Amino acid sequence: KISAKANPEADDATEIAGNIVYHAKYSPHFSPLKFGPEQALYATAESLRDRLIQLWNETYVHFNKVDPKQTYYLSMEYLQGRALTNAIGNLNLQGPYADALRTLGYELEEIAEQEKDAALGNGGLGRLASCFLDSMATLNLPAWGYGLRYRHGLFKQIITKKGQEEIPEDWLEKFSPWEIVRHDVVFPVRFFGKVQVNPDGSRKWVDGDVVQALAYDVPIPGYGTKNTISLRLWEAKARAEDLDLFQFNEGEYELAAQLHSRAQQICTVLYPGDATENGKLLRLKQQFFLCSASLQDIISRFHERSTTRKWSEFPSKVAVQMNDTHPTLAIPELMRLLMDDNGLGWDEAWDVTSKTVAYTNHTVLPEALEKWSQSLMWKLLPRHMEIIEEIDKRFVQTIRDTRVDLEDKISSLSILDNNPQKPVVRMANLCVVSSHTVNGVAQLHSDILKAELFADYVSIWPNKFQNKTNGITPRRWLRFCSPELSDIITKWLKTDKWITDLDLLTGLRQFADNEELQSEWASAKTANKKRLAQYIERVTGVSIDPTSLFDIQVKRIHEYKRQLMNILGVVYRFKKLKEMKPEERKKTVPRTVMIGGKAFATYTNAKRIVKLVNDVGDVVNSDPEVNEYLKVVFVPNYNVTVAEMLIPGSELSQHISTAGMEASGTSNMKFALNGCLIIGTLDGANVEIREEVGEENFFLFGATADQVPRLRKEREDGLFKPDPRFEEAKQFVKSGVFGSYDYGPLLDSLEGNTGFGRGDYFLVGYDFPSYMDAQAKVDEAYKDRKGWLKMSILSTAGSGKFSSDRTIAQYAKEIWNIEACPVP
Amino acid sequence: KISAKANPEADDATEIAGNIVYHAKYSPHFSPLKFGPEQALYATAESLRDRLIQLWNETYVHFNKVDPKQTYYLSMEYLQGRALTNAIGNLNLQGPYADALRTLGYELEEIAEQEKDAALGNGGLGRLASCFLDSMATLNLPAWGYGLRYRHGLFKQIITKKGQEEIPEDWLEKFSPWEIVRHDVVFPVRFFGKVQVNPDGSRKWVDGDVVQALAYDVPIPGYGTKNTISLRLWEAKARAEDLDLFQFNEGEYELAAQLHSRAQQICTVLYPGDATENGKLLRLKQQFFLCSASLQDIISRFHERSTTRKWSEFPSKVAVQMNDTHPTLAIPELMRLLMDDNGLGWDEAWDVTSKTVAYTNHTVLPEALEKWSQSLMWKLLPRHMEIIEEIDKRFVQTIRDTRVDLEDKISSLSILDNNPQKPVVRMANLCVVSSHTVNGVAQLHSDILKAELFADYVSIWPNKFQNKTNGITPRRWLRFCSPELSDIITKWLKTDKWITDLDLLTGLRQFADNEELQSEWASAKTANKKRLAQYIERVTGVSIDPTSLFDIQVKRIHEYKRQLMNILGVVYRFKKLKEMKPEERKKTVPRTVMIGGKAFATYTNAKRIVKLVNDVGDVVNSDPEVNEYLKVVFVPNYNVTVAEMLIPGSELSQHISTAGMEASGTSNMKFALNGCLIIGTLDGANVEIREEVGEENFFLFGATADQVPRLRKEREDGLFKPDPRFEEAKQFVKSGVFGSYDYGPLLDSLEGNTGFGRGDYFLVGYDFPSYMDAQAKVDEAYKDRKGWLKMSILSTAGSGKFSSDRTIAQYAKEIWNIEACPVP
């Protein structure tokens, strides 16, 4: 009935309905008879993109006129998730859009479910990046992100009888309605080739392969602001003229299209397998391609703002932030662009580069810092190796000529490790030496960087090193994912200003004992639990009881994350439930356990752990004697959407990594913000959460990070004494109770005292008893409903500090020296 | 200045200007700073596509409600050219769009020049297809075309010092604003695999590769009607799930993506080189892909129109027309879809197939009819070979049962040639045996098919064979490419109804001697010649004199087309001009010779001819003693756009193929319609043109088709006597006058009496003298300006018969049994 009428600025139900129908008809991607939910999604998204374009454009023009110092965030991952709910929310158009879609015959919820997540990231590195973008927008900061437009993500995880199987993502196999292609924004990116030395001493990278980098903008709208910034993504492309027709017409199709194939490879998947030289080269190509395209674009915008400019202004007008060591090549690439393409001398280009770049480190373990073969780097990126060797020459000369106390450490401090067997470039060393600031992501992590990992560098530059505690946006992670709870918070604080000033949540503490609030709290959590139930049934086929305790663990599958401990706990609780009399079973607290996460495909034990969880669920969930008191579900394809479904409905979440292994952990912060209590080790963000929410609202257990090496040494000296419940759990897994899959090889990782891959290095067995004791505390606290709801309210009430708004403001002031630039 | 305001139905300058700016802003493909000619082009096209969508939709719905019999035209080529001018013209929005672009700061002409031709075809087969689509739309016929969405055409021709070089077309490297993707219209297409026999006797093609066939519609608007039909184009695609991640992550990138690569190959170029087994298989895959995707879509639309349907209705509701033998596989594919996917028995599916399919043949030479190795067919399309062998078994049984006088000819009449040395499938035989109608494309061609090529088949089915003389649309080829001449015609006929009733042009004959008309005619031709001069200067750098005689030959470069005869004529003319006294040179008619066309890349002598034309021009054009009387220019990258520039400005065109070699030739018709006289052999469309325009208005020469074999035999018997002027032309080319390129090997094709590639089989030497005598007649006729202009007017006046509207109306009534279905 509703007729097409374009209105790019539609802000009421009737105008918005007209604009959606306009796109359906005049921006078609389907046959015109079809107006199903999927077609309704694309039309709605295109209706919203109209407003996004207006704002993006206004923002671009304003930043152009003002010529503020601008920050560019370089990341190999962005976990954008779905864009619909967030776009509608930040434009504060919820009611009008929900009403428009109703007049067109749909519930907004159903349409929202059609959207595929943007497969542009994998883990916490990427979701941090995504949260940061939302906060940069909302704080009106002149800042952008750059990334790669990956076609297939890491992988879509499916769960079969074999356990995890890995299939390419398909989010772009029709189209993304959010992105805007910029066919004028193309930069050449080189690979391989060699260095031409000119008579005047200048140098030029020549020959090799040249790919085209094409820009796509993804608009990022701020909450309660016109300010709309960009996640500018690159697509690697060959030109038509790069296809060799002679070869094609001889039947040599692969040779004919070899440039197109190498360009496609760059944006196929994140973290392509790098056991072989091909893979190592591919990963390096992706990092270089990000770096080179992004820096060419940045330099081009710097010049475009010239009202007449001097290169001395560059580090007063540009900040480049490296998320982890993946964008390390920005350092030598910026030197290359300055000196070769722009004529600067080494000293002037170094002064610019060292004042522009900053490095954020996300790791405790020095073994985990990136290193590349010097031969591979010479092959792919000869001119950059020239620049890197010069950076290292100068640095080492300075240590030799000023720090004689460090002479014996030059072999570890240098960027180039000239080990006779496997000479490498130490990318973290390149980052620390070159960057004006280096930061960690939690206080303890940052102290560990200063005191252990980079101590000799701290000695050289005692003001280089800073902390910036991670955070999460309360838009995506509370306001938009839990609207009913958000309405309760607004009502009781008598303001909605908490959405941009999350510290206002402490105003809930005075009401934590108030039974009317506890009632409304409980109703909210229950609603979310029924929605979650529905979802889990939909996607795993298992019915789950929403009056049961929802216990959730969702992280990357990995021995140090200790999913294996959780699952052995479940196996023990199952066994005891089975042995109990039915009269005794009625005393226990019913529980639905939910584990999810992806396993790196080639990581054998991680894949065995996923298989184990599923085999355990298959048995427990189908056992009519205890399945009223316990169910276990492996939740597949964990991504932002899945987190948006689980987090609002969560009651207990598990953050149980071996102490000392986690720098941070932002999912912890999401769960705490949503009233979900944590069972956790004293590690990463758990430390700060427990501080802010109060130790009485947190379930702590396990060895502490300083005990861990002592306890490993006790194991090696044969002094470990396994708890009987742990031994019984193990045996039961080895009993055959969970089918014909031999779990013996997985569990052998927990056996013995010595050997790589043996001796329970992650202290599954040692922590097990305090872990089970904590789970007993959870049960007892759960049975006291009023006490539970009080703890849940305090958890939300104490979450203010974890806002990514706080984090980004600190970066803005202390590292980038940028400020708000609100679009009028 | 002008503000964005969407108006899909914009019909005046101000509304249209707003809609263009609306697309520029809200359908962006560029950074928002840029509004150059290219960006203007895209925005203007999108503005027009708005109107095209409305009409396409209205048309689709109307055909759906009516359930008329509908024709589907299958072609491996469409020469669509540029769409802008044609779209504006058919919507009769010329004035409003030219004014809109002027208010936005542009001339429509400049915007028009930004458009890349759709590289979807190569030659006359494809432009015929494109003309037919325009006439289907204009005559309100329920008819569509199906084609492949080729990414890179055949090739873009560049001319370098080496002559022709071939580069991939790039029309899709940003996007095409005309097409509409239909993500719900996807069909599976199989290759290789094997045939499963089921216990119930049914058979199923299984295994092998499976690609996805995705539809894109290109709207084809009719002149003076709402009726807008489709050229539906297929893209071959792999699914994301077809990428093998294990292999990708092992560094085996080619293996990982091998399905994606085989899908991409299908739509890379037209006519991929087929000397090797790979290429033969790729060409077959392209034909099968077209056929299978198209027929699945047709069957799906047949069912979608059901009001309740019976299969007996299918051939009353569907006609499939095969343009040449490339869609031969529609016959067995339609039997496969009917019997396997839809459950029909052989006899019912054959009755349906034989009444649905018809075949248009375009060939005089039996050596030219497509044949494929039986083994290759078995490998790629096993189920189709099963069906083909059954068709052939039954047909041969029919000859035994009913036409025992043909028993001895079964080995030539059968579809399967079981020659022990080279067993093949004869695709033409399959087409003739299966189709209810077979037609040729000119009266003489059709008589040759009945009397020689398929005589025994005519004997079996004496009503199968028909003629349908080709034609051209007077919209693209007169009304839109020559607006000024069109305005003169309208003024003198006192009507513009000729645009859809081209036989009205005979009303110009009474005026062919009228001095005022001749004056206006000349003025019109002169304006077109100056535009052509500009263009030639732009695209070759050669400055040409528009008061000279413009002599044009534009066809595929080939020894039988006899560009080599033309160029040797030019070389002789140049030599005589140089030898003349300047007093004598002033007696001659100045001439600009223009040759163009593409050479197949591996066809050595064709490429040598392109080089020769360029080397001759380089010398003549830069010779200040005769370049006032002669210039020669090779016009590069001949395509629809180039013909749109040359044809309106042409005075003489050359259609000089060896007699008996051409079935038709539509470019002949386009020239005749535009008042350009023809120097030509008695062959192809020249026969009918000369009849219609009058023998006094045509320059005929050369051997006739009945003489050709006798003359070839005389050459073999050593009785040929070369004309001295021919010999002198040859020698001068061998003199070194045209640079260091040795033309000896090229000319060796004209030497000797026997040998493949030798002995002047195309009668260049024999026809040369009557050719030079005709060119002499042209010069004399040119000097009599009134007599020339009378002949030019008579040429246009007699061109009515060559309308594609006549051609399609005949197909509609006599072959498809479809009728007008005007959209209200």
Ligand SMILES: OC[C@H]1O[C@H](O[C@H]2[C@H](O)[C@@H](O)[C@@H](O[C@H]3[C@H](O)[C@@H](O)[C@@H](O)O[C@@H]3CO)O[C@@H]2CO)[C@H](O)[C@@H](O)[C@@H]1O
């Ligand atoms: O302003 C001085 C100078 O700076 C730049 O030269 C640097 C090169 O760009 C860089 O490769 C490196 O040069 C070394 C070569 O790699 C090596 O092969 C050998 O020749 O030693 C060189 C010096 O150590 O370092 C220099 C400068 O230190 C810029 O390219 C010059 O144009 C510019 O004049």
Ligand SMILES: OC[C@H]1O[C@H](O[C@H]2[C@H](O)[C@@H](O)[C@@H](O[C@H]3[C@H](O)[C@@H](O)[C@@H](O)O[C@@H]3CO)O[C@@H]2CO)[C@H](O)[C@@H](O)[C@@H]1O
């Ligand atoms: O008419 C009913 C019957 O028709 C269809 O069968 C045909 C097959 O589809 C077709 O291939 C061909 O089959 C021959 C096989 O190719 C070959 O192996 C040979 O040895 O024997 C077969 C029979 O000639 O011909 C038959 C029809 O003559 C349809 O698929 C059947 O299900 C249906 O029963």
Ligand SMILES: *Cc1c(COP(=O)(O)O)cnc(C)c1O
């Ligand atoms: C927040 C989030 C993460 C990061 O969580 P960690 O605690 O570091 O494991 C990862 N994936 C998704 C989908 C997230 O939403």
Ligand SMILES: *Cc1c(COP(=O)(O)O)cnc(C)c1O
């Ligand atoms: C009309 C046309 C053709 C068909 O020409 P023939 O005379 O059949 O060779 C080929 N190419 C182009 C660009 C045309 O416009």
